[PDB]
Amino acid sequence: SSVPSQKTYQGSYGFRLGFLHSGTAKSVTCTYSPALNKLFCQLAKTCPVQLWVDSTPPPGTRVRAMAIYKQSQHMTEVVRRCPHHERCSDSDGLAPPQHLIRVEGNLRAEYLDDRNTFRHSVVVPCEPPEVGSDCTTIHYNYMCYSSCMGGMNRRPILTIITLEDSSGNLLGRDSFEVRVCACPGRDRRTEEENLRK
Ligand SMILES: [Zn+2]
């Protein structure tokens, strides 16, 4: 399948992602490494991602998330749940069982299977920040381990977040690598040490 662009693009509204500072304790379920631009998270745990804009986009703007393989030799392969997890009885009523990425706690989430590329994505309406806040947050879940056989199979993935208008045209784009693993704090520490070495 053709490969979606991963080029960072702030666009007219100054769109970019942000992440909370969670640390690398053994108790951490989700931690983001700025040095690696990489999120480490446990299976099906809440991953809060901040959406930042310099100016408010029009009503009907939406935010889409999609996973692609990071490595050149695999980026044409659709990222999907492995044969085991796609048959898990863990439906939330909205997400198709094949989709790796879910949005948690948003009843207006929509899930797309692209008719031409067959890629999966999940999209929600963009909303203005609440009273007293400067950004909005989306809660994502990753429903397969990076290591799952017959699925990601230890291959790294990227999540691409796109800001879109009501027709789906591109307004902004940002991305981050993801590792879904049992011990995100330990793995983030290891990979940051390797990068230093
Ligand atoms: Zn799996």
From Swiss-Prot:
Q: What is the effect of changing H139D?
A: In LFS; germline mutation and in a sporadic cancer; somatic mutation
What does the UniProt record report as the effect of altering G151R in this chain? In sporadic cancers; somatic mutation
Question: Where is region (Required for interaction with FBXO42) located?
Answer: 19-142
- Consequence the record notes for mutating I101T: In sporadic cancers; somatic mutation
Q: Impact of altering I68T?
A: In sporadic cancers; somatic mutation
According to the record, mutating F40S results in: In sporadic cancers; somatic mutation
Effect of substituting F40L: In sporadic cancers; somatic mutation
| Name used for this protein in its record | Cellular tumor antigen p53
Species of the source: Homo sapiens (Human)
Q: Which gene encodes it?
A: TP53
